[PDB]
Design an enzyme around this catalytic site. Sequence first.
Site, short mmCIF file in Angstrom:
data_model
loop_
_atom_site.label_atom_id
_atom_site.label_comp_id
_atom_site.label_asym_id
_atom_site.label_seq_id
_atom_site.Cartn_x
_atom_site.Cartn_y
_atom_site.Cartn_z
N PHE A 1 3.06 11.19 3.75
CA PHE A 1 2.88 10.09 2.82
C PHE A 1 3.54 8.86 3.43
O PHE A 1 4.53 8.99 4.14
CB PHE A 1 3.52 10.54 1.50
CG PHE A 1 3.39 9.60 0.30
CD1 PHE A 1 4.17 8.45 0.17
CD2 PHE A 1 2.47 9.88 -0.72
CE1 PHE A 1 4.05 7.61 -0.93
CE2 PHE A 1 2.34 9.03 -1.82
CZ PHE A 1 3.13 7.90 -1.92
N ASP A 2 3.02 7.66 3.17
CA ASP A 2 3.57 6.45 3.76
C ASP A 2 3.44 5.33 2.73
O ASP A 2 2.43 5.27 2.04
CB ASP A 2 2.82 6.04 5.03
CG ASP A 2 3.15 4.66 5.58
OD1 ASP A 2 4.33 4.30 5.55
OD2 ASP A 2 2.24 3.94 6.07
N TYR B 1 -8.80 8.12 12.23
CA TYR B 1 -8.23 8.56 13.50
C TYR B 1 -9.14 9.54 14.25
O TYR B 1 -8.77 10.05 15.30
CB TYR B 1 -6.83 9.12 13.26
CG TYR B 1 -5.92 8.00 12.77
CD1 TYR B 1 -5.46 7.04 13.65
CD2 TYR B 1 -5.59 7.86 11.43
CE1 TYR B 1 -4.62 6.01 13.23
CE2 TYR B 1 -4.77 6.83 10.99
CZ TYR B 1 -4.28 5.91 11.89
OH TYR B 1 -3.52 4.89 11.43
N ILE C 1 -6.92 0.61 11.15
CA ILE C 1 -8.08 1.48 11.19
C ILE C 1 -9.30 0.75 10.59
O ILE C 1 -9.19 -0.17 9.77
CB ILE C 1 -7.83 2.81 10.49
CG1 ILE C 1 -7.38 2.62 9.01
CG2 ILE C 1 -6.88 3.69 11.30
CD1 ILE C 1 -7.37 3.92 8.24
N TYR D 1 0.82 -1.19 0.00
CA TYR D 1 0.00 0.00 0.00
C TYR D 1 0.86 1.26 0.00
O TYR D 1 1.99 1.28 0.50
CB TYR D 1 -0.89 0.04 1.25
CG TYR D 1 -0.13 0.41 2.51
CD1 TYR D 1 0.54 -0.55 3.26
CD2 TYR D 1 -0.04 1.74 2.91
CE1 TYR D 1 1.25 -0.20 4.40
CE2 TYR D 1 0.68 2.10 4.03
CZ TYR D 1 1.32 1.13 4.78
OH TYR D 1 2.00 1.54 5.89
N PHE E 1 -5.73 5.83 0.44
CA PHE E 1 -4.81 4.72 0.25
C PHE E 1 -4.96 4.10 -1.13
O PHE E 1 -6.06 3.91 -1.64
CB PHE E 1 -4.99 3.56 1.22
CG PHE E 1 -4.67 3.89 2.66
CD1 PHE E 1 -5.64 4.43 3.49
CD2 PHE E 1 -3.41 3.62 3.20
CE1 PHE E 1 -5.35 4.73 4.81
CE2 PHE E 1 -3.13 3.95 4.51
CZ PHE E 1 -4.10 4.51 5.30
C1 LIG Z 1 -0.85 6.29 13.21
O1 LIG Z 1 0.37 5.58 13.04
C2 LIG Z 1 0.63 5.09 11.79
C3 LIG Z 1 -0.17 5.32 10.65
C4 LIG Z 1 0.23 4.79 9.40
C5 LIG Z 1 -0.56 4.98 8.22
C6 LIG Z 1 -1.93 4.37 8.45
O2 LIG Z 1 -2.82 5.08 8.86
N1 LIG Z 1 -2.10 3.05 8.23
C7 LIG Z 1 -0.96 2.20 7.92
C8 LIG Z 1 -1.32 1.03 7.14
C9 LIG Z 1 -2.44 0.30 7.74
C10 LIG Z 1 -3.61 1.24 7.77
C11 LIG Z 1 -3.35 2.42 8.65
C12 LIG Z 1 -3.20 2.01 10.04
O3 LIG Z 1 -4.01 1.29 10.63
O4 LIG Z 1 -2.08 2.49 10.65
C13 LIG Z 1 -1.93 2.06 12.00
C14 LIG Z 1 -1.12 0.77 12.03
C15 LIG Z 1 0.21 0.74 11.70
N2 LIG Z 1 0.61 -0.51 11.86
N3 LIG Z 1 -0.48 -1.27 12.30
C16 LIG Z 1 -0.28 -2.72 12.57
C17 LIG Z 1 0.76 -2.87 13.70
O5 LIG Z 1 0.07 -2.63 14.92
C18 LIG Z 1 -1.55 -0.45 12.39
C19 LIG Z 1 -0.66 6.52 7.87
C20 LIG Z 1 -1.34 6.68 6.50
C21 LIG Z 1 -1.40 8.19 6.22
C22 LIG Z 1 -0.03 8.72 5.92
C23 LIG Z 1 0.81 8.65 7.22
C24 LIG Z 1 0.66 7.27 7.92
C25 LIG Z 1 1.45 4.10 9.33
C26 LIG Z 1 2.24 3.90 10.47
O6 LIG Z 1 3.43 3.22 10.50
C27 LIG Z 1 4.01 2.96 9.19
C28 LIG Z 1 1.82 4.40 11.68
O7 LIG Z 1 2.65 4.27 12.79
C29 LIG Z 1 2.45 3.03 13.50
#
Ligand code: A1H7E
Length: 128
Positions: A55-56, A101, A75, A45, A118
């Site tokens: 951006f990630d 969030y 999320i 992704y 995404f």
């Molecule tokens: C809020 O923290 C994060 C959010 C996200 C991204 C994010 O929001 N997601 C990452 C991919 C999965 C979907 C969503 C998310 O749930 O992030 C929380 C997350 C990150 N890792 N996990 C599994 C490990 O517990 C859950 C976000 C997208 C917007 C641009 C800046 C970062 C990535 C992160 O680490 C790479 C992260 O730090 C843990």
Amino acid sequence: GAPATVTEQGEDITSKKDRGVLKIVKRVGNGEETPMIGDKVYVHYKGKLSNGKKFDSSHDRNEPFVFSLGKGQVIKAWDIGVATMKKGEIAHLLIKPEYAYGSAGSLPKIPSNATLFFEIELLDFKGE
Ligand SMILES: COc1cc([C@@H](C(=O)N2CCCC[C@H]2C(=O)OCc2cnn(CCO)c2)C2CCCCC2)cc(OC)c1OC
């Protein structure tokens, strides 16, 4: 751009029908089957904030992102969205804050009331 195209043409995949999670399929996947709750799921992704400030990518770190579907490890928009996807599928999601969030955000990375975008590729899923 891709976010605007989803906001205009994207299918509302929420149960509540509140347009909180909008989806476009960008590359159609293989087979009829989508993952069940509890399935181990493998994705690549790219993701960004609506405000343009963050951006990630999994691709950045070159390694697939792996999680257990429907367990709230990600999320809510992902638990909803990735469950609609077939193996090999690539999709766009646009996500209101209520499915991400929320009002609190996740500072300093994510502000309060942020919209997220995404691009997701579903590589594979396996049963636990
Ligand atoms: C809020 O923290 C994060 C959010 C996200 C991204 C994010 O929001 N997601 C990452 C991919 C999965 C979907 C969503 C998310 O749930 O992030 C929380 C997350 C990150 N890792 N996990 C599994 C490990 O517990 C859950 C976000 C997208 C917007 C641009 C800046 C970062 C990535 C992160 O680490 C790479 C992260 O730090 C843990």
